[PDB]
């Protein structure tokens, strides 16, 4: 029918994927084994009898995270070939995960993803997960996109990546790894979405009253966006949005593709008791800087085209009125070569409520994908961090030792400079 | 012992109160878009 | 499958390692007789890191024990966990230690080195994978200081890729137990700087100070001191053995913490430490763990961080905790004390979390840092080396073993260059 | 994940030490130490009575 | 329908408010939990349940007063978002509540009031409460009005404040805060009402029969006046008065807006055994200086336009005779250029009594709002007290240290002097 | 969440503070073992102001005890409520007090200063918020006056915004326990004027006078006298701990009562104090409290208000009571005695009401006032200081510690100017 392939790279990818496939199996009604006690085929293959197998490939250069699943409850769910593990991790070193370690396992990875695609008669895109600071997320992720571009060409390659936070940081060499990977992403990726832990932490504490979140809580929120993103191909509605529609509607140019995400409503059970949460309220909550999953103020820049997705008993009359209201906010700035400004989407399947969840049952929910020039702030933040280290050659010896050539460091600095120029040039006056 | 000099403390207090230093300092923080090398090659690369 | 080879050299290294295996065997649940009788399946996941299995359910550690005289060897043999070790792994000479660096490196070291390396080769080639080597030795002695560096050069020659992590004990600043330490330490530094990837320095005097200030110990024997050190050894490699939310192994630690090839000497610490009786008054939470970690008194090396500046720092967390709580605390401690961190390196604090804490504790943490305060320690030994060397004095005992006076001049020159390098990057 | 989030966390979670020397506080915990010789008094009395017999 | 939003500031505003809302919920027939055992839309909103929610926001810079509601019986009625509490109060310092501590929470509150106005389809005005002597009441109230003026603009912002008493005082720095606040109030407020505690003590002991009152009894009397003011929008009547009508009829100029309050009959009801309390009786009782809620005698000044509000059994025939009689009274003056002088309204619903009550269940009552030049007496006292302290600069160092500049002290002192002659020129006739 | 850190200095500080925690623990209902066994939910509302909790439901006060000799604390620890305090907050030296201000300031103060500050840093940075510190000490001694002022400067430098409220006991005029008191008090004032925000003056003679006049105690001990002081400390912070009709915390008091930065010394008084036989005659009414608070005999400082004029006055009331009745009394007492009030400040009486009364009482009140009568107390010790200084008296003891003779001249000049400052504003 219509299909999409999910690939998880590094700890931050596979750990999110564990929560995602929990939500998807529960939504469709498939037990963790893969049997039953529809849209199954867009995510799963039916091996026969009554068993289902997901379309996922788990990859990391160290076996600890994958062996958790292999020993976990879901071990029978997956194909053992899908679960791919290396021997020793990349040690947060881009050169180590791209030149030395990455190339030993890349061809094994490409066979299984290509073998998985043969069974997919009507495949229409890929979903790939990174963390920018990781060696495997960046070093191995770059090598994977480069090969898939020639392997599959004009197939939409969508990415869901964790953006390095402004102040929260767990890797010291983190700015070095992001810039080198950014060069490979910018040419090959069709569109790559941004989320960051720092904003999700604050959102998980304010809107949801979870004072002290873990990585587990944040993975469920990301799972709901992908569920809402892919729900148009699965369940019935009134305005269907395919993957290819995202590629044309969101990005005006080739190098300005990076969007940001938002979701509404996110509310605890004891707050939703007092709130109706109709169409007007959920539309307004999206555009507050508090709800953005990337910690950048939209008021710093301007907005180009946005895409909105609704899941619930939503009537088209209310959708047009809410966006009409959104255009009346003078605190929201749009660019005048984007007077259209919007694409809408409506679907009837409500959000899925995982048992023991942190989310209240809401009857309609809206997801927002928006592209803005506010993220030019974030690149200038990351660019400055790189300069201080490289002025004194702070960590070059580790990279050079693992096959990396030093000449790529200024070239990667050059490409980011052009990307920074492209934003102010786009955001410039008509 | 040397006696203190007579001083009109009310006049000095009258003058001093406008001069009281503020407790909390202000902070207008520059945005990184304002960087002097925005969209252009940093100068330190040639030395590197 | 990230096996680690352990080597014990000298009296100081051997007895610390003997206590070190008690800590691990308790944590995994391995009997002194090498039997497993534990309580959790998670202990058997990656026991392969430190142990080999003998047919019959008997587990034998990857330990190689080295000495020049069998005096300390028999003490370990009669120990509580003496039966654990592999009997053929005991390698020893038949001559007095001499407490002479030249004698240990040149006279007896050459004869013992050829046997020691092949015993290492037995264990290093026996396993499916090998990440790095683990050495415990002191720097003021004659066997560990000399033979340890000799073996370190050979291990570098044969295994260039592997991480050569070593743990060293530094002679005390006020009172120390050897007349000729400045010669031994200055000679040893030249080898350690160029050969070892990671070196951890621990001082005896800080260990006594930790015992009385925090632990209140009335009569702290060497067992309590060896207890403190082995916890840090257990904390570092725990990321290999047990799962967690964010894994961080040795090579991650080396890449993050070491900005330049020669600035890789580290200070260590551990938290929490029970003031016995008092901690009924203490509430242990994640912020409280951070307070002890970055408190200057809990550092195990007698170099004050406040008199220098930090370059990199890293902390591990063990137990179930909030991930946001850890990440906020690193931001909090870094922002409140900006004077002690360098500007040209943003986000100077690395973090890590692991799920399985040591038995009984809800949470525990380990701190590893790199700072310019090490210039205090190297100035100490250089100054003593200088005024001994001018009078010549005990050089008479090193000349008759085949060591040239130019080696003293080269050793000081390399040591002083290390000092200036730490000075320059302070700017 | 309620245990980490809840504010009665300090109330409910059992404390780290109980009377003499808890059976769940193993050696790896690093809280059982040997330097507190609570047998010092008895050893001291025995040693002098050993000295008294010698004298 | 038509909506009014209530904002409460400080200890006075919050704990006056819970007195007001216990009145309205009992009046409409809503249990404290929001369930039931009409005009609900004017003050409440309905959710996806049989549950209601007030249109109110409680604001204070210290948590003690608000937390009493949070643990009280009424905790289930309010939305958790509506109750906003700071960390440390302003310590009766206007500068601390305006610049340093006020700006720490201003934007958090402004989102919540704006969000509530979205649910108000027919919003027509706001209600805001102050106590002048408090730091939060004057300092943060000024910052709130300045922002609200540009946010909404042409909407009627009505205020209900407690003027510092002529002799009773609880703060030594009290004159400083009132004058600085008066500057911000005068330009932005559409219309604000004066009452003072000293008159409310005297009325509650003389008319009502209580030996020893508390703030609880005074807070209930204030609620009755607001109840009568808002009864026109809620229940039926032969002559309705909207909020916008009060703005135009009462104030002759921009800067002379400040009216005073009165109410009749206020009676300890054993005294109500003796009398029938006809329309003429209650109309006469309004104009005695003893019944004024502000302790200034109108006989020193003159009357401009007055507004009369009748509730209950009153009939339009009897009103006309009564007001005609009060015009014949030669103890009451009116300025020459206001021959009309009156605005009348009649509503059918009599007042509502409360358990543990203080008042009677009488069948008819009347409420008054009058603008008089006698208020110029109060300004002279406050100005005189301000000059005594300021000549020797008795408390300036506290204000300047908390972000205040000294030049604001005389400039705020100049405008009140202009207001003092504003009242003197208007008091003249030609 | 307005946490307060409590610091006790000297023999006077430790004895007063130990009795202070007996008062609060009973009020909130904390068993001396440290566990809650109370009777009302309102007690657990805002216990965070003074107590931290340890894992296991045990509450520990935010107390730091400071002395130069360990004699006093072992007496305090052996007291009934000694187990409550954290063992590691006890900071002491191993040297005699010496009854010397210079010795306390320079010789022994510097050694203990660094250790004490980090103990403060633990408690100051362990809470979500911090409003101010609280110091209890005497001025006639050497440890409370000497090290107390040195710690006062360091607290101001690190934490400028926070309120450094101090409670002081002034040496008595008739019979006093130390010869060299004029030296210690004169030097101490210079530090208190510039650093501390609020100062309360307590004289031992007035405490004796109140005990024999009102309470008719035939043999009062230091327990009786210290109990009276503890009530005022409990009363002032009661607005933070319990709800009320009109709140007034520490920062409100400083804003209202202090017109100029250097005039912040205060006198305190507490009502109702009732004799054993007068209780059957005294009908407890709000006017009855007003008579006691403004009665001159109830002043706890031996400086007569009638000899001076009032600048500001403040009264707190505890219990469920009428707001009209309290406000009317403030106006009545102000208008009846206008000869003792300044013209250029009207409404000199500030008022507040609190809901929950102290244990055993239905209604209670607290008074804090600021007046020019302090010129009596400073003139007294200035007169004694001058004669002891005109000839060089015991002075050589101070010079042999490091103190320069010009510091005495600076100490008097600063103190004398504060006397003149109150003289001018009386006009
Ligand atoms: N949201 C979320 N982020 C995670 C999670 N785990 C790790 N991360 C993020 O991952 C980033 C670092 O990437 P890595 O964890 O090192 O992943 P990697 O690509 O495998 O890198 P290596 O482990 O060195 O091979 C950090 O900034 C974390 O914020 C998770 O469970 N949830
Ligand atoms: N009528 C009435 N007046 C009150 C009440 N509570 C306080 N007041 C008056 O409020 C005035 C002082 O203002 P505050 O109570 O300090 O209010 P605030 O703005 O919160 O002051 P801050 O504590 O600095 O925030 C006094 O004159 C009181 O008479 C009340 O419940 N009813
Ligand atoms: N921590 C610790 N240190 C020890 C122990 N035994 C000896 N040392 C110290 O180790 C230092 C040098 O040891 P040494 O005997 O010379 O080792 P060698 O090089 O093998 O000869 C001495 O200063 C001792 O204080 C021990 O059991 N524990
Ligand atoms: N009110 C009160 N005063 C005390 C107490 N103990 C001592 N004092 C007085 O404090 C004064 C000085 O005390 P001192 O011994 O010098 O304390 P130091 O600061 O530790 O040296 C003496 O005059 C005592 O009368 C007490 O428990 N209560
Ligand atoms: Mg990885
Ligand atoms: Mg307030």
Beta-carbon contacts of C149 under 8 Å, excluding residues fewer than 6 positions away, are C105, C188, C191, C192, C195
Q: Which structure tokens are listed for A371?
A: 């592209």
Check residue E63 and report its DSSP letter.
Answer: H
Which positions in chain A touch C249 (Cβ < 8 Å)? 62, 89, 91
Is the CB of D28 inside 8 Å of chain C's CB atoms?
A: yes
Question: Contact E208/E358 with Cβ under 8 angstroms?
Answer: yes
For F179-182, the CB contacts below 8 A with 24+ separation are F179/F394, F180/F99, F180/F100, F180/F394, F180/F397, F181/F140, F181/F381, F181/F384, F182/F381, F182/F384, F182/F385, F182/F388
Question: Contact C247/A11 with Cβ under 8 angstroms?
Answer: yes
Phi, psi of C64 (to 5 degrees): -125, 125
Nearest CA-CA partner of C22 in C88, C86, C84:
C84
Experimental method: cryo-EM
> Of A66, A89, A90, A134, which is best to mutate to test ligand 1, by the most ligand atoms within 8 angstroms of its C-beta?
A134
Q: Does the Cβ of F61 fall within 6 Å of ligand 4?
A: no
Nearest CA-CA partner of E94 in E401, E417, E407:
E401
What is the nearest CA distance from F418 to chain B, expressed in angstroms?
10
Question: For chain D, how big is the Rg over CA atoms in Å?
Answer: 21
Q: Which structure tokens are listed for C397?
A: 């005992």
Which positions in chain C touch A64 (Cβ < 8 Å)? 243, 247
Task: Determine the Cα–Cα distance for residues A372 and A426; give it in Å rounded to an integer.
Answer: 11
Q: Is C208 left (phi over 0), alpha (psi -120 to 50) or beta?
A: alpha
Q: Does the Cβ of C177 fall within 6 Å of ligand 3?
A: yes
For E53, the closest of A274, A281, A284 (CB atoms) is A274
The three-state DSSP-derived secondary structure of C20-43 is HHHHHHHHHCECCCCEECCCCHHH
Q: What does the DSSP assignment read for A216-268? A: HHHHHHHHHHHHHHHHHHHS-EEE---HHHHHHHH-SSSS----EEEEE----
Question: Contact A406/A396 with Cβ under 8 angstroms?
Answer: yes
What resolution in angstrom units was achieved for this structure? Answer: 4.2
Question: Contact C333/C325 with Cβ under 8 angstroms?
Answer: no
Question: Contact A368/A311 with Cβ under 8 angstroms?
Answer: no
**Residues followed by a break in chain C, C–N over 2.5 Å?**
none
Point out the ligand nearest to the CA of residue F169. 4
Secondary structure of residue F402 in the 3-state scheme: coil
Question: Whose CA is closest to atom 3 on ligand 2?
Answer: E12
User: Is residue E245 among the annotated active site residues?
Assistant: yes
Beta-carbon contacts of E379 under 8 Å, excluding residues fewer than 6 positions away, are E416, E419, E420, E423
Question: Contact C43/C173 with Cβ under 8 angstroms?
Answer: no
Sign of CA dihedral C194, C196, C200, C201: negative
Taking the CB of residue F82, how many other CB atoms lie within 10 A of it? 15
Secondary structure of residue C276 in the 3-state scheme: coil
Burial of E410 (0-12, 13-18, 19+ CB in 10 A): exposed
Task: Determine the Cα–Cα distance for residues A30 and A129; give it in Å rounded to an integer.
Answer: 24
Task: Determine the Cα–Cα distance for residues C290 and C304; give it in Å rounded to an integer.
Answer: 18
Q: Which atom of ligand 1 is nearest to the CA of A136?
A: 19
Q: Which of E62, E198, E245, E408 does the annotation list as catalytic?
A: E245
Q: How far apart are the first and last CA of chain D?
A: 69
What is the nearest CA distance from D48 to chain F, expressed in angstroms?
30
Task: Determine the Cα–Cα distance for residues E229 and E234; give it in Å rounded to an integer.
Answer: 10
Distance F177 CA to ligand 4 centre (A): 8
Task: Determine the Cα–Cα distance for residues F164 and F130; give it in Å rounded to an integer.
Answer: 11
Question: Contact C68/C108 with Cβ under 8 angstroms?
Answer: yes
Sign of CA dihedral A197, A201, A207, A212: positive
For F55, the closest of C278, C283, C295 (CB atoms) is C283
Q: Which structure tokens are listed for E289?
A: 């200086």
CB contact under 8 A, E118 and A271: no
Check residue C77 and report its DSSP letter.
Answer: H
Task: Determine the Cα–Cα distance for residues A51 and A32; give it in Å rounded to an integer.
Answer: 10
Q: Does the Cβ of C146 fall within 6 Å of ligand 3?
A: no
- Helical segments of F258-358, H only: 286-294, 323-336
Q: Which structure tokens are listed for F61?
A: 């006060």
Q: Which of A198, A245, A281, A408 does the annotation list as catalytic?
A: A245
Question: Whose CA is closest to atom 17 on ligand 1?
Answer: A134
Task: Mark whether D and B touch (3+ CB pairs within 8 Å).
Answer: no
Sign of CA dihedral C398, C402, C408, C414: negative
Q: Is F129 left (phi over 0), alpha (psi -120 to 50) or beta?
A: beta
Question: Contact E83/E386 with Cβ under 8 angstroms?
Answer: no
Which positions in chain B touch F409 (Cβ < 8 Å)? 1-2
Helices (H) and strands (E) in chain E, counts: 16, 12
Which positions in chain C touch D19 (Cβ < 8 Å)? none
Check residue C341 and report its DSSP letter.
Answer: B
Q: Which structure tokens are listed for A165?
A: 């936070």
Q: What does the DSSP assignment read for A38-104? A: -GGGGTEEEEETTEEEE-EEEEESSSHHHHHHHHSGGGGTS-TTTEEE-SS--TT-HHIIIIISGGG
Taking the CB of residue B6, how many other CB atoms lie within 10 A of it? 8
**Half-sphere exposure for F139 (CA within 13 Å, toward CB):** 26
A-E C-beta contacts closer than 8 Å: 25
Task: Determine the Cα–Cα distance for residues F253 and F370; give it in Å rounded to an integer.
Answer: 11
Task: Determine the Cα–Cα distance for residues A219 and C367; give it in Å rounded to an integer.
Answer: 29
E-contacting residues in A 308-367 (Cβ below 8 Å): 363
Task: Determine the Cα–Cα distance for residues B33 and A78; give it in Å rounded to an integer.
Answer: 46
Q: How far apart are the first and last CA of chain A?
A: 43
What is the H or E stretch that residue A194 is in? strand A191-195
* Cα angle for residues E362, E367, E370 (degrees, 5° grid): 160
Nearest CA-CA partner of C237 in C368, C80, C149, C41:
C368
Taking the CB of residue F280, how many other CB atoms lie within 10 A of it? 8
The three-state DSSP-derived secondary structure of E207-269 is CCCCCCCCHHHHHHHHHHHHHHHHHHHHCCCCECCCHHHHHHHHCCCCCCCCCEEEEECCCCH
For B38, the closest of A381, A391, A424 (CB atoms) is A424
Question: Contact F366/F268 with Cβ under 8 angstroms?
Answer: yes
Bridge partner residues of C170 (DSSP): C203
Task: Mark whether C and D touch (3+ CB pairs within 8 Å).
Answer: yes
Nearest CA-CA partner of D11 in C281, F51, F53:
F53
Beta-carbon contacts of F301 under 8 Å, excluding residues fewer than 6 positions away, are F170, F201, F202, F203, F206, F267, F268, F377
Query: To the nearest 5 percent, what fractions of chain B are helix, strand and coil?
Result: 40, 0, 60
Whether cis (ω within 30° of 0) applies to the bond prior to F272 is yes
Q: Does the Cβ of F12 fall within 6 Å of ligand 4?
A: yes
Taking the CB of residue A202, how many other CB atoms lie within 10 A of it? 14
Distance E159 CA to ligand 6 centre (A): 18
Question: Whose CA is closest to atom 9 on ligand 4?
Answer: F12
**Residues followed by a break in chain A, C–N over 2.5 Å?**
37
Distance E62 CA to ligand 6 centre (A): 6
Bridge partner residues of C427 (DSSP): none
Task: Determine the Cα–Cα distance for residues F24 and F4; give it in Å rounded to an integer.
Answer: 14
Task: Determine the Cα–Cα distance for residues F367 and F346; give it in Å rounded to an integer.
Answer: 18
Q: How far apart are the first and last CA of chain F?
A: 42
Distance C13 CA to ligand 3 centre (A): 8
């Amino acid at each position: 029918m219509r299909e999409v392939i999910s690939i998880h790279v590094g700890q931050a990818g596979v750990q999110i994927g564990n929560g995602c496939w929990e939500l998807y199996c529960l939504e469709h009604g498939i037990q963790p084994d893969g049997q039953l006690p529809d849209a199954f085929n867009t995510f799963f293959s039916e091996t026969g009898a009554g068993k289902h197998v997901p379309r996922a490939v788990f990859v990391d250069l160290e076996p600890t995270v994958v062996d958790e699943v292999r020993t976990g409850t879901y071990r029978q769910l997956f194909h053992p070939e899908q679960l791919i593990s290396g021997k020793e991790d990349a040690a947060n070193n881009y050169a180590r995960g791209h030149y030395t370690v990455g190339k030993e396992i890349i061809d094994l990875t490409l066979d299984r993803i290509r073998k998985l695609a043969d069974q997919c008669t009507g495949l229409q895109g890929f979903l790939i997960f990174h963390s920018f600071g990781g060696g495997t997320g960046a070093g191995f992720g770059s090598l994977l996109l480069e090969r898939l571009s020639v392997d599959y060409g004009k197939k939409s390659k969508l990415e869901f990546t964790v953006y390095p936070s402004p102040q929260v940081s767990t890797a010291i060499v983190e700015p070095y790894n992001s810039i080198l990977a950014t060069h490979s992403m910018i040419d090959h990726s069709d569109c790559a979405f941004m989320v960051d832990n720092e904003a999700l932490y604050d959102l998980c504490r304010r809107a949801l009253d979870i004072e002290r979140p873990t990585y587990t809580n944040l993975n469920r929120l990301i799972g709901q966006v992908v569920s809402s993103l892919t729900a148009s191909l699965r369940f019935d509605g009134a305005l269907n949005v395919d993957f290819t529609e995202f590629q044309t509607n969101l990005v005006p140019y080739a190098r300005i593709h990076f969007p940001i995400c938002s979701y509404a409503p996110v509310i605890s059970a004891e707050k939703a008791y007092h709130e109706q949460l109709s169409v007007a309220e959920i539309t307004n909550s999206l555009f507050e800087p508090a709800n953005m999953m990337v910690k950048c103020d939209p008021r710093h820049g301007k907005y180009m085209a946005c895409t909105l997705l609704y899941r619930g008993d939503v009537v088209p009359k209310d959708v047009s009125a809410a966006v009409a209201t959104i255009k009346t906010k003078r605190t929201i700035q749009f660019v005048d070569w984007c007077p259209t400004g919007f694409k809408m989407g409506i679907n009837y399947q409500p959000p899925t409520v995982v048992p023991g969840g942190d989310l209240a049952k809401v009857q309609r929910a809206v997801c927002m994908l928006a592209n803005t020039t506010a993220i030019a702030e974030a690149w200038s933040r990351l660019d400055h961090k790189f300069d201080l280290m490289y002025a004194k050659r702070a960590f070059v010896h580790w990279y050079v030792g693992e096959g990396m050539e030093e000449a790529e460091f200024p070239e990667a600095r050059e490409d980011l400079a052009l990307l920074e120029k492209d934003y102010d040039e786009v955001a410039a006056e008509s | 012992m040397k006696s203190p000099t007579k001083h009109n403390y009310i006049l000095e207090n009258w003058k001093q109160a406008p001069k009281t230093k503020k407790l909390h300092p202000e902070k207008p923080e520059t945005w990184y878009t304002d960087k002097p090398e925005y969209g252009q090659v940093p100068a330190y690369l040639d030395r590197v | 499958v990230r096996e680690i080879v352990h080597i014990q050299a000298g009296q100081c290294g051997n007895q610390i390692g003997a206590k070190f295996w008690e800590v691990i065997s308790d944590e995994h649940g391995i009997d002194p007789t090498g039997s497993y009788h534990g309580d959790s399946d998670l202990q058997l996941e990656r026991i392969n890191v430190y142990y080999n299995e003998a047919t019959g359910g008997k587990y034998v550690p990857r330990a190689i024990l080295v000495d020049l005289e069998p005096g300390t060897m028999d003490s370990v043999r009669a120990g509580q966990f003496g039966q654990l070790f592999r009997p053929d792994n005991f390698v020893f000479g038949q001559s007095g230690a001499g407490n002479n660096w030249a004698k240990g490196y040149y006279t007896e070291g050459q004869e013992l080195c050829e046997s020691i390396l092949d015993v290492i080769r037995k264990e290093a080639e026996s396993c499916d994978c090998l990440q790095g080597f683990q050495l415990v030795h002191s720097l003021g002695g004659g066997t560990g200081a000399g033979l340890g560096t000799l073996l370190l050069n050979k291990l570098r020659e044969e295994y260039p890729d592997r991480i050569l992590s070593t743990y060293s004990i530094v002679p005390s600043p006020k009172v120390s137990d050897t007349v000729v330490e400045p010669y031994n330490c200055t000679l040893s530094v030249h080898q350690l700087v160029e050969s070892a990837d990671e070196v951890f320095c621990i001082d005896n005097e800080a260990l006594y100070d930790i015992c009385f200030r925090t632990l209140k110990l009335t009569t702290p024997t060497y067992g309590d001191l060896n207890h403190l050190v082995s916890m840090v050894m257990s904390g570092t490699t725990c990321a290999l053995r047990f799962p967690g939310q964010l894994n961080s192994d040795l090579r991650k630690l080396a890449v993050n913490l070491v900005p330049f090839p020669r600035l890789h000497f580290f200070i260590v610490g551990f938290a929490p430490l029970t003031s016995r009786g008092s901690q009924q008054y203490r509430a242990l939470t994640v912020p409280e763990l951070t307070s002890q970690l970055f408190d200057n008194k809990n550092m195990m090396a007698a170099c004050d961080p406040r008199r220098g500046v930090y370059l990199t720092a890293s902390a591990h967390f063990r137990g179930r905790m909030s991930s946001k709580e850890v990440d906020e605390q690193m931001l909090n401690i870094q922002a409140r004390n900006t004077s002690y961190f360098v500007e040209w390196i943003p986000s100077n604090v690395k973090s890590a979390i692991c799920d399985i804490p040591p038995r009984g504790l809800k949470m525990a943490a380990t701190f590893i840092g790199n700072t310019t305060a090490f210039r205090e320690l190297f100035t100490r030994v250089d100054s003593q080396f200088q005024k001994m060397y001018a009078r010549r004095a005990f050089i008479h005992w090193y000349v008759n073993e085949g060591l040239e006076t130019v080696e003293f001049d080269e050793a000081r020159s390399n040591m002083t260059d290390l000092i200036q390098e730490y000075e320059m990057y302070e700017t | 994940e309620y245990d980490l989030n809840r504010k009665d966390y300090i109330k409910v979670q059992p404390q780290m030490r109980i009377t003499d020397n808890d059976p769940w506080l193993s050696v790896s915990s690093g809280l059982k130490f040997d330097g507190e010789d609570l047998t010092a008094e008895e050893r001291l009395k025995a040693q002098k009575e050993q000295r008294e017999r010698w004298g």
